[PDB]
Amino acid sequence: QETQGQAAARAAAADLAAGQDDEPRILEAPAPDARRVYVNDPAHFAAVTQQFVIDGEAGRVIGMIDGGFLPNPVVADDGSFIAHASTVFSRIARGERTDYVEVFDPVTLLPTADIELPDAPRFLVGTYPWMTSLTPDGKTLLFYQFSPAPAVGVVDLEGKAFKRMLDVPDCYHIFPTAPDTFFMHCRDGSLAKVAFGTEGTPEITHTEVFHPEDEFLINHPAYSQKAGRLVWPTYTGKIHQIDLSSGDAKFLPAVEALTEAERADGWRPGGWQQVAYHRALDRIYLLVDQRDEWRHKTASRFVVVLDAKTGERLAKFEMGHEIDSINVSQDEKPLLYALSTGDKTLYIHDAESGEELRSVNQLGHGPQVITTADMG
């Protein structure tokens, strides 16, 4: 009931009445925990951007990180660092391009590494979380290149150096499964497994094709590295699940997030980060609404929750706002994070009852990307 601005007015007023001194200084953010959540603001393609670091339990901004043009954020699952791949130009948006990776301390937010990526090799695209990805040991960052051809860049975080580009087939996205192995999704409807080394052609192995050429797999699948679970909705809310926990792809039974009657009445997923997965509960969360079929990036006002094993619906929440992206905290009694690009506001919901608990507004110009650590 008492707001954070109100509690602070009251504490300042008591220190002034008590004659309590304190030294103005630079704060540290609180230790990273399960209820820490990061919101990135691509700012509708502005040349410079911002990330907000938020305490989900209090609904308070605890820090910010500046970025350049369409940066890719990553968060180590263990809470030990965060990083991004970013792009600047010598005269705002013109002149010499520099692509680079920074690593930051998660409490001081100071950069601890600034690693130049040679020959401007980043993919400049509205931000897809799985276009830049950490290996499970946290030692390597992998980023996608599109131009001149699909390729994956390898950055050694521990030695703070760019290593090499890997040539890959006509494939997209990067789901790391081991210190030297990741998956990609191919134009042909397969996944490719890419096992790499410091030098040498990587070993590239395709899975079976798993979807027809006219089912469309969204740009924001959810992937839980610790579960090895790749959760991939199509435009109709059909959900593909791939188990990569063995190090090889295993195709799980597909589930339908909407019923046949809902589909007949125009229910479809839509937004930006349309899907979330909670590893400990093995639960899938999908943003859906009634919409024409080619309005697939519009906000949605409902979230459906379903059991990943059975596909049984557990809940349908009415969010009460225009929501573009969702994610969840990975602890018990998780939070459901519901980010509105149009309101520039993160709404924080109880994931069990769907009830809005609190919200954090003024999050930049067009915030779209929610990231959390799986520290469990």
Binding site: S147, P148, A149, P150, P169, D170, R187
Partner: protein, 355 residues
Amino acid sequence: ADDALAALGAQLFVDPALSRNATQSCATCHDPARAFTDPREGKAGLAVSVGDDGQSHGDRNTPTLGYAALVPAFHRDANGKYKGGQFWDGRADDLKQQAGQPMLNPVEMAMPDRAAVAARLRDDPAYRTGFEALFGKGVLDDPERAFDAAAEALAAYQATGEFSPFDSKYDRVMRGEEKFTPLEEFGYTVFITWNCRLCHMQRKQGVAERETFTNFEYHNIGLPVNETAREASGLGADHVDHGLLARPGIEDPAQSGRFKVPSLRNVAVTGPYMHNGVFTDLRTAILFYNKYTSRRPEAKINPETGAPWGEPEVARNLSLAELQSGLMLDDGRVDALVAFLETLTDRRYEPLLEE
């Protein structure tokens, strides 16, 4: 008379009596069975054609006559681009100015002069009747009138439906009579979104009424000399083919090494490719464009020789703004573009697509 002028040109087109030794007609090099191109093997394979003397080889590949009647007469447009004309270097203003040239060229039909061509026309009673009915009595007695008339007839004949039928698969699909396969459709999509559309579409925007997949401009794409063709032509190791700058009256050094953009209709059946016949395979002509974009070592290599593409014959005035697209065609996209370009083959040449 529209029909009759064309019918006269039909007769001339297949008549070898317009060659010095009477061994060669238009159709010898522009063979109707091969989309009007030369099926004959010479010292440089099919890269260049052999003349009426049985020994002289040209230095340029014989192009199709299909769809040549859609090209505008030679002119400089508003933004200072030369456009239109005939020959790889635009040196002829139009079809009519072009026709008389192979007839007097000693490396081709080799007639010594106009009077000699008039003397051949006057020996054939069918030509006396047909020529006089269209151009007046005594036409064939006046070398200049006779020569101009023959060229006029030949130009009329290349303007008939026979040379430009618009009955390729692409045309059927555009009328809604059938559908592209997924591969051809991908190839179409690639062609229209990648750099190809910047030179191999009639218009800069909008839709063309009779698309022939060229903007009729002049570009230097930086091709090497074809050594065996250049050896066969006898022009010498030191010869440079200056393209458009060789057109009389063009003096601008920026025009050096630029050639007319060919129509891609029938491209699948009119190999070998480019102005000097340097590449045998259509795939190889498409892969050439990756030399400007790709980082892979294989992009520097002509897959027909296993050696580097080669130094441009003219290493200045390259169309680098258009060629340096920043994107490599992967093999799936080369496959798609081959598929698409195959749908530009006229119906009667579809049987040739197997070969």
